[PDB]
């Protein structure tokens, strides 16, 4: 599949024509750039030490996201019958890739707690790990089924 491709810029460092022009009316329209975003801040933020800890844990979070992406792109596609879930069917946070990447509404109470995210990030990471574990269980079931496949019928067709 596709790895992470999000840009990095705070509110005070918008690259558009105006500070609020990042969402729309930016020069990216002239260049046909598909960039889109919508603010969704948390209830509160941690201290400087908490910020540094979150930055350190972001590496592990990205590694887990990459592992989940690799599992989803490999196990489903290799079966030649599981890749039928399109972007709308596999919509992120209930919105397709057109709208999922244009907003951060996934920060609601489902994976995080809509609260200081120092531990909410870890909780969401644990939830994603559980989802990836379920996907791995499904992949193991598919492997056992393939073991059931290529059964005694794989031998000769008789008189051999």
């Amino acid at each position: 599949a596709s790895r992470y491709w999000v840009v990095s810029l705070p509110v005070q460092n918008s690259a558009a024509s105006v500070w609020n022009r990042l969402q729309e009316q930016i020069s990216k329209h002239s260049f046909d750039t598909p960039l889109y975003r919508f603010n969704i801040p948390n209830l509160r933020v941690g201290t400087l030490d908490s910020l540094l800890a979150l930055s350190d844990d972001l590496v592990k979070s990205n590694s887990f996201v990459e592992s989940v992406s690799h599992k989803i792109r490999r196990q489903i596609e290799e079966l030649e019958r599981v890749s039928g879930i399109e972007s709308s069917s596999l919509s992120v946070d209930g919105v397709p890739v057109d709208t999922y990447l244009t907003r951060f509404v996934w920060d609601e109470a489902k994976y995080p707690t809509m609260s200081p995210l120092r531990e909410i990030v870890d909780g969401i990471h644990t939830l994603v790990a559980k989802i990836e574990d379920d996907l791995k269980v499904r992949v193991a079931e598919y492997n056992n089924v393939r073991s059931q496949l290529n059964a005694i019928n794989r031998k000769q067709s008789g008189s051999l």
């Binding site: 509160r44 933020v45 941690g46 201290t47 400087l48 908490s50």
Partner: protein, 46 residues
């Protein structure tokens, strides 16, 4: 920068103090419950 760190330190100190005060109130409720129990015991003895 530093002002944001100032707010976080004050907010953490304020929340900790409020939690400590609530815990002290709960401890006081338990203490008055124990005092009422022992007062009932001594009244029954009398």
């Amino acid at each position: 920068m530093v002002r944001f760190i100032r707010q976080e330190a004050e907010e953490k100190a304020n929340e900790i103090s409020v939690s400590a005060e609530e815990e002290f109130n709960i401890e006081k409720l338990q203490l008055v419950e124990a005092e009422k129990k022992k007062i009932r015991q001594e009244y029954e003895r009398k």
